[PDB]
RNA sequence: AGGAGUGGAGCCUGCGGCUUAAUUUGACUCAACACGGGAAACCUCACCCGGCCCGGACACGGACAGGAUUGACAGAUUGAU
């Protein structure tokens, strides 16, 4: 509870990158849900297609997947690792995706308390 | 001084010429010519006719997760799943 929800994606996408559990993309990210093993999805409200959100909110809800609301979709390309770093630590090449799906969690508890208390409050 | 010969004959293998889409090529007195350990069906293979592939490291710019190449049944096309 010491960390905010809008920054709660950061450390969990870092600790799950070491196990290759981040579905960059949209089609293969949605097909990970049809493997019935993914655990969370993030929708960026800065969107481009009205057809795009109404399918993914229909897929994640009926198969019991919650949601993390972050605004911008070029912003989500950083923590998935889809952006190339510069020499001193800046994303010199910005490539941002609008759908991020995790499959397996990292081995920690600094995010595994805050994502759980964000989960249980909307039940 | 001799012996066996070779050069004549048939065939086997080299080398020139001619021929060819190509008949890959080096070596030309001893000191090139059953030599390249060279007895090539394919491979060897260089040569000829046709076709596939990148096995183009890395550095930089674009495309870029409303995507970059990739792989693939059938049908036609093909020498050819």
From Swiss-Prot:
GO biological process: cytoplasmic translation; maintenance of translational fidelity; positive regulation of canonical Wnt signaling pathway; ribosomal small subunit biogenesis; translation
N6-succinyllysine carried by residues: 120
GO cellular component, one term: cytosolic ribosome
The keyword Transmembrane is annotated on this UniProt entry: no
Subcellular location as annotated: Cytoplasm; Nucleus, Nucleolus
Chief place of localization: cytoplasm
GO molecular function, one term: structural constituent of ribosome
Superkingdom of source: Eukaryota
Classification via Gene3D superfamilies: 3.30.1330.30
Residues annotated as signal peptide: none
Entry keywords, A to Z: Acetylation, Cytoplasm, Nucleus, Ribonucleoprotein, Ribosomal protein
Subunit structure: Part of the small subunit (SSU) processome, composed of more than 70 proteins and the RNA chaperone small nucleolar RNA (snoRNA) U3. Subunit of the 40S ribosomal complex.
Similarity section: Belongs to the eukaryotic ribosomal protein eS12 family.
Record's function text: Part of the small subunit (SSU) processome, first precursor of the small eukaryotic ribosomal subunit. During the assembly of the SSU processome in the nucleolus, many ribosome biogenesis factors, an RNA chaperone and ribosomal proteins associate with the nascent pre-rRNA and work in concert to generate RNA folding, modifications, rearrangements and cleavage as well as targeted degradation of pre-ribosomal RNA by the RNA exosome. Subunit of the 40S ribosomal complex.
Name of this protein: Small ribosomal subunit protein eS12
Organism: Homo sapiens
High-level lineage: Eukaryota, Metazoa, Chordata, Craniata, Vertebrata
């Amino acid at each position: 509870g010491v960390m905010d929800v809008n920054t709660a994606l950061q450390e969990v996408l870092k600790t799950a990158l070491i196990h290759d559990g981040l579905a960059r993309g949209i089609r293969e990210a949605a097909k990970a849900l049809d493997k019935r093993q993914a655990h969370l999805c993030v929708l960026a409200s800065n969107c481009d297609e009205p057809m795009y959100v109404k399918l993914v909110e229909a897929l994640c809800a009926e198969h019991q997947i919650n949601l993390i609301k972050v605004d911008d979709n070029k912003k989500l390309g950083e923590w998935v690792g889809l952006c190339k770093i510069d020499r001193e630590g800046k994303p010199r090449k910005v490539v941002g995706c609008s759908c991020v799906v995790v499959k397996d969690y990292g081995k920690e508890s600094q995010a595994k308390d805050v994502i759980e208390e964000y989960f249980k409050c909307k039940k």
